[PDB]
Amino acid sequence: SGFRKMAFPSGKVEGCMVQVTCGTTTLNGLWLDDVVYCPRHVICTSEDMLNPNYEDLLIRKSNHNFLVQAGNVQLRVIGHSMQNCVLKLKVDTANPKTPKYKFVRIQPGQTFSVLACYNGSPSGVYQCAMRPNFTIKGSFLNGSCGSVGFNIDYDCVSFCYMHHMELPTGVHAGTDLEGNFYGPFVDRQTAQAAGTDTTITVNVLAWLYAAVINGDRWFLNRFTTTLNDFNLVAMKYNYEPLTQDHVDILGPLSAQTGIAVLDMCASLKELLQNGMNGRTILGSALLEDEFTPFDVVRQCSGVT
Amino acid sequence: SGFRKMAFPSGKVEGCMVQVTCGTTTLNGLWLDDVVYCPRHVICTSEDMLNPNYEDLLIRKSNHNFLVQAGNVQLRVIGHSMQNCVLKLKVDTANPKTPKYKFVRIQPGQTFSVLACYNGSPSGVYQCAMRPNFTIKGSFLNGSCGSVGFNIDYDCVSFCYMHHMELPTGVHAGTDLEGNFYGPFVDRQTAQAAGTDTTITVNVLAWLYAAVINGDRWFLNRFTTTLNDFNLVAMKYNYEPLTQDHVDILGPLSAQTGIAVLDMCASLKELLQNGMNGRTILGSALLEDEFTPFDVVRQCSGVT
Ligand SMILES: *C(=N)[C@H](C[C@@H]1CCNC1=O)NC(=O)[C@H](CC(C)C)NC(=O)c1ccc(-c2cccc3nn(C)cc23)cc1
Ligand SMILES: *C(=N)[C@H](C[C@@H]1CCNC1=O)NC(=O)[C@H](CC(C)C)NC(=O)c1ccc(-c2cccc3nn(C)cc23)cc1
């Protein structure tokens, strides 16, 4: 028993991290087969990052201007091309540790594990949710760019995120593995603002199910509600709309705990208009919206 | 920037996890060199676990009664011996993925990463602090036994914990890699109580430094205090004594942020007798004592 923020085992992704150095800028790359992926601002100086022309910068670079290193061995760059905000370097050697992988573009509200790397070497792992405003609340220092977010399906590593930027508010923004940013952000050292953020309602209800599973039950009331009456109450507190697709995802969790989905909604409706009144849920004085329904089942059933 | 609960990269430990099956009980083992380590209650039935005689049970077992499997290959057990609460099986093959490792017995207040495994395969990773009452607040299902806690020093994996038990209160208890339990617990399905727990004061002050590092500063006052005057206030709130060794560990953190250690103590003294008054620190309405000083420096300097 017990409930914790849990990240995927990072072993498979660790064997793919390489260091990329162009001139003086150094960051991390993703080495799958004989192609290395990294943010395209590897080729910028400190002074180009405030308004760069990545097409111009990439012209003046030959294959030899890029220094890819896996461990204490160098990998020879044979070609290079840019796909949106991601650079792609073809190397003369395919990674013998390459796992079965996929390139997915995740949706807001979904979670993933972040392997924070520096100089092509891992430093830690944690879990992040893609906010409704297409940001993530991560923990990245200088040189962390190139670190990847991922999910694991049995044996297939699903890469979904690559770190690029930190916003003035402290949150972070990045792209998928095709160079396409999440949200209306650009890779440029300039002031940018994210949209106003909302609370992921489904993740809150799933967190309440993990609460009931682990014995926290003081918030369950005898009432039920309809889906529409819950939405009109939840929105004045800036909670995301609950749709029928959402109730359907919460289905199996509602079956394991015996609590109807709309009964848990009536409990959340009471939580928002009454507060917690000095009590905590899962040792937390605040509600939590960074646990998807799939995350809860994984921790409470052991997917492995 | 940003601050998150961060676990070590679990790649090295992943290559050491094997499945151990004795008769019908199945759990996880630690395969380093040609020796596999696992909890000794692998040899119990469901009915023996309420008051087992592990010496008696181990007699009636030959080398062949143990089924060690790494992936889809079987490892042949050549010898077996028990060291306290840990079983040791000698196999005819040494793990080619064996890392540089050490067996350490950590102190209360220190943290480590937990690789939760089932059927010899990893399912997730998270960070845990060894409580002052020698328990840990983990997340373990049935069959998780044999999962190990560890810390990584550059290239050396320091194993310090092996999961054994869940207490009636939901917390968890285990041993080091020599079979020696942390605290006054025994491997037996019977009601046991841990000592009354306390708040790790040093970890709280280090968490406040990470707060200041990341811009959270509303709690810093203009006052200072002496170490003894802080301890007399902190203890009525069940906070651990702050000793000179403790101020010395917080030293380098106090140097990076420019705040004297005893100035941060005067701020914590004000926090305990006045509360937070509706404000949060690091997005948390509660104080946090599961971040050691070393954890904070790692996340705010990138040890890698
Ligand atoms: C990648 N190596 C690095 C990681 C990033 C920087 C350190 N922490 C992080 O999360 N990414 C960058 O350095 C990136 C490079 C560009 C994409 C070319 N730049 C930024 O992440 C960045 C953008 C914008 C600002 C910025 C601008 C105006 C005002 C302002 N106020 N704050 C606070 C930040 C501001 C800073 C950094
Ligand atoms: C290891 N495979 C397993 C993991 C453990 C069980 C599931 N979640 C966990 O954390 N460990 C065991 O099954 C272990 C085996 C013994 C060491 C032989 N037993 C327990 O972990 C355990 C001990 C005691 C109790 C128990 C006893 C009396 C009252 C009571 N009230 N609650 C709540 C638990 C109680 C249960 C389980």
Curated annotation (Swiss-Prot), chains A, B:
Q: Where in the cell is it found?
A: Host cytoplasm; Host Golgi apparatus; Host nucleus
Domain Peptidase C30 intervals: 1-304
Q: Which reaction does it catalyse?
A: TSAVLQ-|-SGFRK-NH2 and SGVTFQ-|-GKFKK the two peptides corresponding to the two self-cleavage sites of the SARS 3C-like proteinase are the two most reactive peptide substrates. The enzyme exhibits a strong preference for substrates containing Gln at P1 position and Leu at P2 position
According to the record, the protein's activity is controlled as follows: Inhibited by pyridone-containing alpha-ketoamides compounds 13a and 13b. In turn, alpha-ketoamide 13b (tert-butyl (1-((S)-1-(((S)-4-(benzylamino)-3,4-dioxo-1-((S)-2-oxopyrrolidin-3-yl)butan-2-yl)amino)-3-cyclopropyl-1-oxopropan-2-yl)-2-oxo-1,2-dihydropyridin-3-yl)carbamate) inhibits SARS-CoV-2 replication in human lung cells. Inhibited ex vivo by michael acceptor inhibitor N3. Inhibited ex vivo by compound 11a and 11b.
Q: Which residues lie on this side of the membrane: Cytoplasmic?
A: 1-304
Query: What happens after mutating residue 205 to V?
Result: In strain: Zeta/P.2
What domain of life does the UniProt record list for this protein's source?
Answer: Viruses
Q: Where is this cross-link: Glycyl lysine isopeptide (Lys-Gly) (interchain with G-Cter in ubiquitin)?
A: 5, 90
* Active site: residue positions: 41, 145
Q: What is the effect of changing residue 90 to R?
A: In strain: Beta/B.1.351
Subunit relationships: 3CL-PRO exists as monomer and homodimer. Only the homodimer shows catalytic activity. Interacts with host FBXO22; this interaction promotes the proteasomal degradation of nsp5.
* Protein purpose: Cleaves the C-terminus of replicase polyprotein at 11 sites. Recognizes substrates containing the core sequence [ILMVF]-Q-|-[SGACN]. Cleaves and inactivates human TRMT1, preventing tRNA guanine(26)-dimethylation of tRNAs. May cleave human NLRP1 in lung epithelial cells, thereby activating the NLRP1 inflammasome pathway. May cleave human GSDMD, triggering alternative GSDME-mediated epithelial cell death upon activation of the NLRP1 inflammasome, which may enhance the release interleukins 1B, 6, 16 and 18. Also able to bind an ADP-ribose-1''-phosphate (ADRP).
Protein known as: 3C-like proteinase nsp5
Gene behind this chain?
rep
